[PDB]
Write a protein that binds this ligand. Structure first.
Ligand SMILES: Nc1ncnc2c1ncn2[C@@H]1C[C@H](O)[C@H](COP(=O)(O)Oc2ccc(C[C@@H](NC(=O)[C@@H]3CCCN3)C(=O)O)cc2)O1
Ligand SMILES: Nc1ncnc2c1ncn2[C@H]1C[C@H](O)[C@H](COP(=O)(O)Oc2ccc(C[C@H](N)C(=O)O)cc2)O1
Ligand SMILES: Nc1ncnc2c1ncn2[C@H]1C[C@H](O)[C@@H](COP(=O)(O)CP(=O)(O)OP(=O)(O)O)O1
Ligand SMILES: Nc1ncnc2c1ncn2[C@H]1C[C@H](O)[C@@H](COP(=O)(O)CP(=O)(O)OP(=O)(O)O)O1
Ligand SMILES: Nc1ncnc2c1ncn2[C@H]1C[C@H](O)[C@@H](COP(=O)(O)CP(=O)(O)OP(=O)(O)O)O1
Ligand SMILES: Nc1ncnc2c1ncn2[C@H]1C[C@H](O)[C@@H](COP(=O)(O)CP(=O)(O)OP(=O)(O)O)O1
Ligand SMILES: Nc1ncnc2c1ncn2[C@H]1C[C@H](O)[C@@H](COP(=O)(O)O)O1
Ligand SMILES: [Mn+2]
Ligand SMILES: [Mn+2]
Ligand SMILES: [Mn+2]
Ligand SMILES: [Mn+2]
Ligand SMILES: [Mn+2]
Ligand SMILES: [Mn+2]
Ligand SMILES: [Mn+2]
Ligand SMILES: [Mn+2]
Lengths: 218, 217, 217, 210
């Protein structure tokens, strides 16, 4: 069964934009994490242990749930134990490195891939993650696209996050992503071939990078 | 887009158990009415015009949304315009007869159908529709399966409504016949499955037409 | 200890304005009903037994809590037993008659009273009670001032309810209350003076009439 | 006039006991901060500019509202602008010092004062402000009395905070357990100390006679 249900995302902030979705977190035991999208809705499924682990580890997403989430119902108090476990870290350089390195892979290999929508979705994930992580290190808790652009005013932050649900395949994405990486003083990881990025993602445990690279194939 | 979102059903009452689903209503403009079931969740999609019509027509489901629904968000105020349009009727005999007639068909043809799940679900619909309507007529707003059996205490109400969540099969026909007796029900003047199709079309029993043709699939 | 808190009124409808208050209902065990107003906040205190009684008696205020109230927290489920006990009556002529009789007393004696604020509050109470009850009798659940004037289109409904928080002493209030009473085919009860209004309110169990009458003095 | 309403405190955590209150925050334009207490309810009134200031200055109480408060309604979106302005400070030693100095004053002079109630309220504030400051510096967000004693397990932490006879023995036992140092101060030198260190709560308490 489903122990608890939380509204998060822009709907929990009372904000909306052109193609906004509705974000719902369903806590149910004995299931591996997954999500289902259905006509502008998004259902995120987590088991209770994974929810508590994200708080103990100080996941940026866990910070969002505790900062802006709204409980719809909670029959087990799992969201209370979730907030009790939350430990906000002082250093998110690991998350910054993941978004940094995947941005370089997408720059080197993603701009002509067939799955344009996945590239755009994950280009935004890179810029979003770096912006969220850098702001938390500075003592701020920011998650909305409009506020990330104002609080982390690097080159093309708004444009690149705006790709999150776009099928835009213009080559101006490559020039803008390169300008953003330059504005944050990014350096490409010591890799070249696609196979080397795979090994580097494994070495640095960049799960989203591995999922993105493999997902672009088919 | 999605203007408003409402939690309804047993979760909105804090009465979810093990077999319970999670009921969510999403108001989206332009979409045709449909539902989607995903891992114990049920998403109901309506356009604003359809939502207001159910209020003006005093639909039993609309009374549930207005009485027990818990608004999660509503950017357009559509739920307020929904409640201002609500007109509870003093007479729900039309809805009562729809469930009464379909109950007779399921008693006469559904007890040995292949799709046992659909028959069990639609048997629960007949009993629940009748219980809800009778209680609204007396001035009560009741929708919990447990409270429907206490406030509408007819024979086997809890057992038959429980058939949606499914059990003592092959005694269902006896329990359904017992319920039809306790409500002083009468079978409509039909005696063929085609005569049931004809009766459902005259009386505009859409749930019956869907049920009958759904058992053939 | 406060076991449950509910938001009601216009804030729960998402349509409060600059002149609105914030309506909060607090349930505390072993306490008699009373109200405390604080910097445009209104705190209503009830015990669980009084709350559930208003549902069983079908109080018009209880209908509002059930169809428009939003729970802030509820550690005892008292709002769940509240809704299970609700019984909407087919007739509210008693509440209508209470509002009519008090309106006539204010018209006959209150238009030059010292406590103008109390008179303006209870004038709005009379018209609101009558409008709410009539709309409930017709199967509708209306409570906001704007919708009451639209759904109960009688003379000066909007103006008279607008006196709720007004210190206006103009005699135009008296002419408007008379025009309203004439539009609902109201008739003054067979009472001569102020003492006969007292004996009438006591005989007819008009608690609000007795409270208002002695409130001016 | 009231544009936003928020529930905070233990009721927002669903952890109210027999002696709890109901904490409500009302944002009202053009008012000075003040609070009304009505039959176990606590209404706190703020203007939007003051609410955003507490976020920009990283007030401990602002962090509580952002991570634990439950919005009842918000007609202006001020709570989102409130959360956008939040800047968690890298250090809260200033707050810890304020609570430490006042505790030493109350230990040296307030254990037999007339207003026994006010002494118990400010003593709890000292221990609570110190505990909450530790929790924020460590990245935690649950400011309940049980969480404070659990995460800050010094002697008699739950006893002192639980003060809303034996009070002196356990207050000194707390200062000893945290290796606290009394500031170099008489009761008149405690005044000159709070004034120099800008301990507002220490000033208003001593004159008692978020
Ligand atoms: N821990 C998280 N971190 C970052 N954001 C998260 C997290 N949880 C939920 N969200 C939000 C919700 C919001 O809606 C946004 C959509 O944007 P996103 O680009 O999908 O971001 C990601 C989404 C999921 C993952 C986890 C997993 N991938 C997947 O399960 C599927 C498989 C194909 C498509 N993804 C993985 O690789 O480990 C990683 C990134 O994601
Ligand atoms: N008008 C409503 N009456 C009762 N319930 C409704 C209604 N609308 C939505 N619901 C949800 C809430 C609950 O979950 C209930 C259980 O479903 P039921 O199957 O028992 O009852 C139905 C069977 C058929 C239909 C027709 C629909 N076009 C379809 O093709 O299905 C509709 C309902 O359905
Ligand atoms: N890369 C990331 N790292 C950590 N947390 C992240 C994240 N991306 C999103 N989040 C968090 C915050 C979102 O508000 C929230 C929903 O993520 P989302 O993809 O739905 C974007 P949202 O803020 O809802 O605006 P909208 O376009 O849908 O209207 O999940
Ligand atoms: N035949 C009918 N006529 C009018 N309204 C009806 C209805 N059947 C259900 N409803 C209303 C009320 C349900 O609570 C609500 C959800 O319908 P549901 O099928 O999910 C049964 P529920 O009350 O949620 O308990 P559970 O077994 O899921 O835990 O939809
Ligand atoms: N005479 C009556 N009979 C039955 N119920 C009555 C009632 N008067 C008020 N109510 C119910 C409904 C109000 O919305 C609700 C709050 O009553 P209220 O006096 O605060 C008027 P409200 O609807 O909130 O608009 P606003 O002027 O404050 O912006 O209490
Ligand atoms: N000295 C301080 N510095 C910063 N923040 C402080 C604070 N004292 C209290 N807070 C925050 C957190 C409380 O939950 C809340 C105070 O509310 P409260 O003083 O009523 C204690 P509470 O946590 O609600 O439990 P209970 O005893 O009422 O049941 O506001
Ligand atoms: N029984 C009842 N009737 C109407 N309003 C009620 C009642 N009980 C509480 N209230 C609340 C609702 C109003 O906002 C307010 C004005 O009541 P008023 O009596 O108009 O001064 O007091
Ligand atoms: Mn979203
Ligand atoms: Mn999303
Ligand atoms: Mn359900
Ligand atoms: Mn359902
Ligand atoms: Mn009001
Ligand atoms: Mn009021
Ligand atoms: Mn409190
Ligand atoms: Mn308090």
């Amino acid at each position: 069964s489903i122990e608890a249900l939380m509204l998060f995302g822009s709907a929990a902030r009372g904000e909306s934009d052109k193609n906004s979705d509705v974000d719902l977190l369903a806590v149910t035991s004995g299931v591996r994490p997954f999500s289902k999208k259905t006509e502008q809705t998004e259902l995120q499924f987590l088991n209770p242990e994974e929810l508590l682990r994200s708080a103990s580890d100080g996941d940026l997403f866990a910070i969002h749930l505790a900062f802006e989430g709204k409980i719809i119902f909670d029959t087990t108090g799992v969201f209370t134990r979730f907030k009790e476990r939350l430990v906000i870290r002082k250093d998110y350089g690991r998350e910054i490195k993941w978004g940094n390195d995947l941005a370089w892979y997408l720059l080197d290999f993603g701009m002509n891939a067939e799955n344009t929508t996945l590239v755009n979705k994950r280009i935004a994930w890179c810029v979003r993650t770096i912006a969220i992580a850098r702001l938390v290190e500075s003592g701020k808790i920011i998650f909305s696209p409009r506020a990330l652009a104002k609080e982390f005013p690097r080159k093309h932050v708004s444009d690149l996050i705006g790709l999150a649900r776009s099928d835009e395949d213009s080559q101006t994405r490559k020039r803008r992503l390169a300008g953003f990486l330059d504005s944050i003083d990014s350096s490409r990881p010591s890799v070249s071939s696609e196979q080397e990025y795979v090994s580097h993602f494994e070495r640095t445990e960049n799960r989203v990078g591995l999922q993105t690279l493999h997902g672009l194939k088919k």
